[PDB]
Structure 1
């Protein structure tokens, strides 16, 4: 656990994360879906609870407010969500799925399943919580 190993580990961490994101996106595109991993993650939230507010979505987003909002504009222009001035406010938005947004649940979850299973096939079920808990304790 001297510097060399920690530097390695930091760098596999960051490169494995980049590869995974990128591979999943390639898979979406190969299948005709021109979306990113970020788009898939935000959709996941809304399939759980539609009409999430914008501010909550940024909270949830693993990302920061300006990036998440930018990502959401793109999703809006691809026809996946709409924005609405809130029933009880001004300046405050609720994000809603369009029909296109809902339609995509089954298919995009299917593709990500296929990706996940192949990507984690050398890993045992019981290693996941280890991996995860180590990830939790970094930083």
Structure 2
């Protein structure tokens, strides 16, 4: 618990803003009509076939009400589909339509490209130092 440097909050926020700006710009130029949260959601559904709406919201630290609307949005765009769960058949399983999987694979490709561009100016040690300091802030909360 030491005094807080005044430049930190503004500096952190400028990085967050620069990242979403650059990502959005590359997403829009490939005309995917997706935002980072959408890409995030498709990625989680693909990596866990049969993912549950409840588990989706939990993994993302978001109220179910929010997650349901986003899913509703993606379903309305034919990127996501829901099907009654066979097991306890009281839940609903999430799956990517063929279009959703395709758009997810392309969005991810541009994501890793933007990531490389954003952190390239940083040496391997500078990056690891950045990860470590960020990690220490969180671990002490």
TM bucket, shorter chain:
0.7 to 0.9
Q: 1:38 touches 1:71 (CA, 8 Å); kept in 2? A: no
Deviation at 1:35, TM superposition (A): 0.4
Deviates more, 1:125-134 or 1:93-102: 125-134
Q: 1:89 to 1:29 in 2, by over 3 A?
A: same
TM-score, normalization by structure 1: 0.83
- Root-mean-square deviation over aligned CA pairs: 2.0
**Greater relative contact order (CA < 8 Å, ≥ 6 in sequence):** 2
Q: 1:46 touches 1:97 (CA, 8 Å); kept in 2? A: yes
Post-superposition Cα deviations, 1:66-121, rounded to whole Å, max 9, x if no partner, equal 3333222222222111122322232x221111111111243222211221111111
Structure 1 runs not aligned, ≥5 long: none
TM-score, normalization by structure 2: 0.82
Equivalenced residues, count? 136
In structure 2, the residue matched to 1:107 is 106
Deviation at 1:62, TM superposition (A): 4.2
1:2 pairs with 2:3: yes
Q: 1:107 to 1:60 in 2, by over 3 A?
A: same
Look up the SS of the partner of 2:34 in the other structure: coil
Q: 1:117 to 1:75 in 2, by over 3 A?
A: same
In structure 2, the residue matched to 1:93 is 92
Whole-angstrom CA distance in 2 between matches of 1:103 and 1:76: 15
